[PDB]
Amino acid sequence: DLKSLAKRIYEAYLKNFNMNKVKARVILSPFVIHDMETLCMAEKTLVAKLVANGNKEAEVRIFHCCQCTSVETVTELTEFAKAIPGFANLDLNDQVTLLKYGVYEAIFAMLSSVMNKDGMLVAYGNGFITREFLKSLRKPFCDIMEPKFDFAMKFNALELDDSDISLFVAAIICCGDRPGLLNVGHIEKMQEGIVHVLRLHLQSNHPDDIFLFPKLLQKMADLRQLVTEHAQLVQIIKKTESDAALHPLLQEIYRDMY
Numbered sequence: 001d002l003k004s005l006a007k008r009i010y011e012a013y014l015k016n017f018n019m020n021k022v023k024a025r026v027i028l029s030p031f032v033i034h035d036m037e038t039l040c041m042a043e044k045t046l047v048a049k050l051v052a053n054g055n056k057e058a059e060v061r062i063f064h065c066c067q068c069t070s071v072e073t074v075t076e077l078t079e080f081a082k083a084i085p086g087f088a089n090l091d092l093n094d095q096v097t098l099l100k101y102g103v104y105e106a107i108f109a110m111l112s113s114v115m116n117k118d119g120m121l122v123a124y125g126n127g128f129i130t131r132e133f134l135k136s137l138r139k140p141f142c143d144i145m146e147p148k149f150d151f152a153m154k155f156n157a158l159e160l161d162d163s164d165i166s167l168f169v170a171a172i173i174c175c176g177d178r179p180g181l182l183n184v185g186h187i188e189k190m191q192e193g194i195v196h197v198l199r200l201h202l203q204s205n206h207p208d209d210i211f212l213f214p215k216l217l218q219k220m221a222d223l224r225q226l227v228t229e230h231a232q233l234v235q236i237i238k239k240t241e242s243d244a245a246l247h248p249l250l251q252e253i254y255r256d257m258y
């Protein structure tokens with residue numbers, strides 16, 4: 001039954017997220033954004049509306065686009081969470097709390113799938129923006145980027161596939177030590193359930209790496225630290241960048257988190 005469970009999670013994953021490792025890799029076998037010219041060209045083609053005006057600084061335009069993808073991923077993650085044994089049985093408040101603290105950890109984890117040493121797949125697989133171009137953005141915007149690449153390079157070295165990743169994201173969501181949780185016991189039990197299936201799955205799908213499970217547990221901790229830091233930088237931008245407004249949904253997510 002745990003094998004079937006793992007499968008269920010994997011199918012929900014393939015079904016709820018527009019992007020996955022296999023699709024990303026086939027594509028990376030896209031318009032390349034490597035400088036300001038290609039950036040502006042990409043915007044006119046892929047998000048025309050955003051530039052059909054008289055327009056904010058390039059850095060802010062990108063920032064807004066990043067927010068847009070996050071809001072979308074929140075929706076995908078919310079639907080995905082229903083395939084986790086016990087999630088849909090939780091109090092609505094706890095479901096909200098679990099998604100609130102888990103979304104960004106999930107987001108940066110899955111982001112690794114479309115990232116390689118030189119850049120990342122963007123805009124529903126229609127673009128590829130270079131890591132170096134992102135580093136060339138003026139501070140503090142160029143500082144949003146790099147930390148995610150650093151994490152992705154190490155995460156991708158674990159050579160996980162979507163069946164692995166789906167369970168990992170599920171595990172990220174089922175976190176009992178999240179602030180405000182009403183029924184921690186039931187949540188801990190749900191968590192124990194997913195980690196158990198994740199442990200067994202890694203064991204059979206990765207017989208060559210006997211430390212994969214421990215490594216991933218560590219990655220979950222890394223992601224949590226990665227997120228608090230990302231939140232800090234977002235906060236800095238919000239306060240110091242007058243033209244860089246934050247989408248209401250994301251403000252609520254960042255509200256009282258870190």
Ligand SMILES: CCCOc1ccc(C[C@H](CC)C(=O)O)cc1CNC(=O)c1ccc([C@]23C[C@H]4C[C@H](C[C@H](C4)C2)C3)cc1
Pocket residue numbers: 033039042043046047061062063064065066067069070071111122123127129134144145146148149234250
């Ligand atoms: C290492 C960099 C990783 O990128 C990041 C970084 C942080 C975040 C989190 C965001 C930051 C505001 C958040 O807090 O929600 C999201 C992404 C995800 N960004 C995207 O998915 C993304 C989406 C669209 C684009 C565009 C931007 C321009 C150029 C090109 C076409 C079009 C217009 C979309 C790529 C770029 C990045």
